[PDB]
Design a protein around this ligand. Structure first.
Ligand code: SF4
Ligand code: SF4
Ligand code: SF4
Lengths: 626, 625
């Protein structure tokens, strides 16, 4: 079918799209078609519903009518406020997840989280020492953890002048943020202040609103996300390189298949633990299954891949299709990017849809709420639900369409530095000599507007062919993995210089660096390189790209990349083109301010050209050859 | 003009609307007409733009298409998420205000706020003791202030199980909130969690979303707003009853007129002090003026009225009209509800539009940023700018249309208890006897959809005639004031029982209790009576009403009133009627959960009937007549 082929580049998606159509199951692509054409005011950002003097919409009329909202706000203010609330929603998604990790570490330090422990005490002591805990190297581990918990909680308070992890950024960058009024002060505070600013009759200057949007995004990348990443490593282990597999073929007909979906590994790590208990495996054996098979979706999947090597079934637009295989016996959901259509599609099969978070409630789901104090008991109950659902699987509707594709994962900054012999000096030498011309983090989602992973893969291929190493996170991980680019043998697909460095280190030309919160690892790496070299992040030959983004979280990531000095490409524009001034700020004005700007470009080859041009300009300023 | 008469009940509004028309100046009412009819999806709440798989809209179509968003979210989820973010924006408006008051008190405690002081040390010691500061009664006042600052800041952190001021609520209400999962834990935390819940693919259950909306609003009423009110009293004085005046006639042709607008008394109080310095006054007199005349707009005007008796020029929809008098020489703005049209209308005259907050930036305004460490010199500078603007006033364009109307203000709970002899017992006895049948807080804004103050005044008049005492805050203050209802002689407009009680105490039948953050005083009063009686707030003969609301802040107030057990009337629906399930929860379902619900009724006489009906039912449950 020409329509099905246009929706994705992948055979396993095509196969499930055919099956979904045969079984009369509507998908995200069908709902996207029903919502096309979309309201122009919504697309442009020129609609405001922030009070009930509205709704207001701004037209561009020669007679000057509908130029202002009822309160007098113009298109610049309305677009900038909508964009600011958009960013705040993304920052809040990461913020609340980082907050849950603080609470989990506190429960471990108090001895009130059965089955949880401090899996990386060495990293605990290092992070705590970095952030100022006294005698972190020698004091009892749970005392050090309690002091680290206090520091992280204080970043979720209202008394700091700068977040704790901001000290990683080079001095020149912290000085610039301070001069601009961009320094993030409190993770929750910046979000709340954004909501205040965007109330009627508060902030009515688009420049001020966009500056606070940058501050709010920075409070995510250097706060909520960075806390989430570093505490997740302490609690569940620091990733090291390991082999795994990707695509819908990681599901197994002869096993109980449990898909974990969402973002929080506090649940997924304990689901995986329950599946390895002897009594639970005997229950699955008694039900007729040969094994219990956990596979990942989206950022929870990314996390379990990085730390445990658990195979990833799919990214964002694969999620519905994973149920359409007929082999998903349970989906275990926590929060964020979990499409509620999955509840309805699961009900078309035997699949249990289990929610675990008080924040991730879905009408019609089976709710088994999980907290650290009860996770071990509750996750056992959830796996037994999956085994029970397995006994009702209709064997005639099972169609697992592909063989899995080998990948390598687990490239934390700790693993990267270890692969380099302990210092970044071999990486700096490679960049100075021009073997690696630069690095681009390719991050972000799928979006039904773009043929799934078409831009993600094309951009990745173009960059590695030009000797630009790619750092992959989020739903790009699955795209690079299915493309065969996440293995060391993929050096044959890179340019001569990048292939040579990859082969000498034994690593792929694309490094999987984790989930969306793990984009904080990319900030940390950039900050380490700039600090080592004595330059700003805006002087490094780096870039970031989200070719197929959709979420507020992805927009917040892009904003904190830009605000930190990383040129950032987006495949689709945010809803801001209704204001030329806001658009010009985002694409050009920010360059004058933070040393980076957004680029919007749906042609991935042209996106590669633009990212490469920035890298080459920055190499020249460093006195390097290109 | 019949169109002009249709826009306001007030003579000063009519006169300035005529003047605006003659001069070609467009107002909020003109822009409201341009935006009519509005998008039906926006009115119903059935539009979602929370990701760029959207925009999505939910329709009711024969083919069954557009029943769901691209992510699969239905109308119940989309409407409830939109309402949740709406409430979060209102809570955030109050929370950042409260946070600013903490920062100011901390600057005073550190000795780094020239011209600021602890005006009410007795209330500082009482509040600090209440919230757990050790030896608050005897320690040095600035040490006590630093420890109270720490307690308030911790409510803006992430480690509490319940906000500090929640202890005021009766135990039965705190137990209910705990069981429901509504207990507010952190002022910023609940706002941030709401923004997380409304991201695509997080909270997709409309009941869950509305319960967290209640928790977010409670974190305002018992957190951001209550902190804002109590610290404002500590820094600037606890209000006591005093006489003042209201309407555009408080402006004076022979004076430099400075209008303070927005919410923060931290700025308006120091502007007032600057205008009283002899050298500043002499500068005005050298410019030809007889004096400097400060008048208030909206909530910062409410604050200056409550504590300093400063006349109030007008409420929300009067703000543009104050400039059209041609006599406003400066507007000094901080944040919230300040319409950006004021900058362009000020540019039609000589008026200086001055912004003072890093959060309240207005393109084209004169920005003179004020912080506690520089407020004394910056406010002096601002007043000098107003005097310079006065020398540019075109006397031919001046038209101050009315004589000002007398009012009484200053009814903090401290002033109410003092007027009662020091205990709520006389008030309880009057309620028991049936002299005062109940109380309604009438709060909230104006809205161009409703003839300005027509419902605010009619509802007020209806309730006091039925022996229901009215507690007025926000822009209802100006409405009740201009109607002559805020003076003791207004007992003559009340029913026999309320008139008798009012005359015995020498108070009006409508008590001005302050700004929008000061709706926390109504919570405090309800919790005091309920705790004294040993019942829930949902057992008290009380109600709340915003007949002409517009703002997210007003919706959050209405939500925390409802979630606290106070039946709450709204003249206009929030943008939720596209979900029958969300609408039914708001109007009916909440009754079975928190003991109160929203009521939507644009006829203010029918609104009075409904509020009275709840009061009578609660009187019967107390075994009263
Ligand atoms: S974006 Fe605005 S104008 Fe468009 S459908 Fe939604 S509410 Fe209506
Ligand atoms: S805030 Fe202003 S532009 Fe937005 S809905 Fe209200 S009146 Fe219209
Ligand atoms: S969150 Fe769902 S309903 Fe809202 S815009 Fe995104 S896809 Fe549409």
């Amino acid at each position: 079918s020409k329509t099905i082929r246009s929706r994705s580049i992948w055979d396993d998606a095509h196969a499930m799209l055919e099956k979904a159509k045969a079984e009369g199951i509507s998908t995200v692509w069908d709902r996207a078609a029903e919502q096309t054409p979309a309201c122009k005011f919504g697309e442009l950002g020129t609609c405001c519903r922030n009070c009930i003097m509205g709704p207001c919409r701004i037209a561009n009329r020669k007679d000057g009518k509908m130029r202002l909202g009822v309160c007098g706000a113009d298109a610049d203010v309305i677009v900038a406020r909508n964009f600011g609330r958009f960013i705040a929603g993304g920052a809040a998604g990461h913020s609340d997840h980082g907050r849950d990790l603080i609470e989990t570490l506190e429960a471990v330090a108090e001895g009130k989280a059965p089955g949880y422990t401090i899996r990386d005490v060495a990293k605990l002591r290092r992070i705590a020492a970095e952030l100022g805990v006294a005698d972190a190297a020698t004091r009892p581990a749970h005392d050090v953890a309690a002091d680290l918990v206090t520091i992280c909680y204080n970043d979720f308070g209202s008394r700091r002048n700068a977040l704790a992890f901001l000290a990683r950024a080079p001095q020149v960058r912290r000085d610039l943020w301070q001069r601009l009024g961009m320094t993030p002060r409190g993770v929750d505070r910046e979000i709340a202040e954004m909501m205040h600013r965007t109330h009627m009759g508060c902030d009515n200057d688009h420049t001020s609103l966009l500056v606070h949007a940058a501050r709010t995004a920075l409070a995510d990348g250097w706060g909520g996300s960075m806390i989430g990443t570093e505490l997740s490593d302490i609690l569940f282990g620091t990733p090291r390189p390991r082999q795994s597999t990707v695509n819908l073929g990681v599901l197994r007909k002869d096993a109980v298949n449990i898909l974990v979906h969402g973002h929080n590994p506090v649940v997924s790590e304990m689901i995986l633990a329950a599946t390895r208990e002897p009594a639970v495996r005997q229950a699955a054996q008694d039900a007729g299954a040969a094994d219990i098979n956990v596979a990942g979706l989206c950022c929870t999947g990314n996390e379990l891949l990085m730390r445990q090597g658990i195979p990833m079934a799919g990214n964002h637009l694969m999620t519905e299709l994973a149920i359409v295989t007929g082999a998903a016996d349970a989906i275990v959901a926590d929060y964020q990017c979990i499409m509620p259509s999955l509840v309805q599609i699961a009900a078309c099969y035997h699949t249990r849809f289990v929610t675990t978070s008080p924040k991730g409630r879905f009408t019609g789901a089976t709710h088994v709420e999980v907290h650290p104090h009860n996770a071990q008991e509750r996750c056992r109950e959830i796996v037994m639900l999956a085994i029970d659902a397995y006994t009702r699987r209709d064997p005639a509707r099972v169609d697992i369409p592909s063989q899995p594709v080998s990948i390598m994962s687990g490239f934390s900054n700790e693993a990267i530095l270890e692969a380099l012999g302990g210092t970044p000096k071999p990486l700096i030498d490679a960049v100075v000599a021009g073997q690696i011309r630069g690095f681009v983090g390719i991050v972000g989602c799928n979006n039904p507007k773009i043929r799934q992973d078409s831009a993600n893969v094309t951009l990745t291929r173009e960059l590695i062919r030009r000797d630009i190493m790619v750092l992959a996170t989020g739903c790009v991980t699955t795209a690079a993995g299915k493309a065969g680019l996440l293995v060391p043998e993929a050096a044959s697909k890179a340019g001569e210089g990048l292939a040579a460095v990859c082969r000498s280190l034994g690593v792929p030309p694309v490094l999987h660096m984790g989930s969306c919160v793990d984009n904080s690892r990319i900030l940390q790496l950039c900050a380490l390189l700039a600090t080592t070299l004595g330059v700003d992040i805006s002087d490094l030959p780096v870039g970031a790209s989200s070719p197929e983004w959709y979420s507020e979280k992805a927009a917040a990531i892009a904003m904190y990349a830009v605000a930190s000095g990383i040129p950032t490409h987006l495949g689709l524009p945010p809803n801001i083109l209704g204001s030329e001034n806001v658009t010009a700020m985002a694409l050009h004005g920010l360059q004058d301010v933070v040393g980076a700007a957004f680029m919007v470009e749906p042609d991935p080859v042209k996106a590669a050209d633009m990212l490469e041009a920035h890298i080459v300009a920055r190499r020249a300023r460093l006195g390097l050859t290109s």
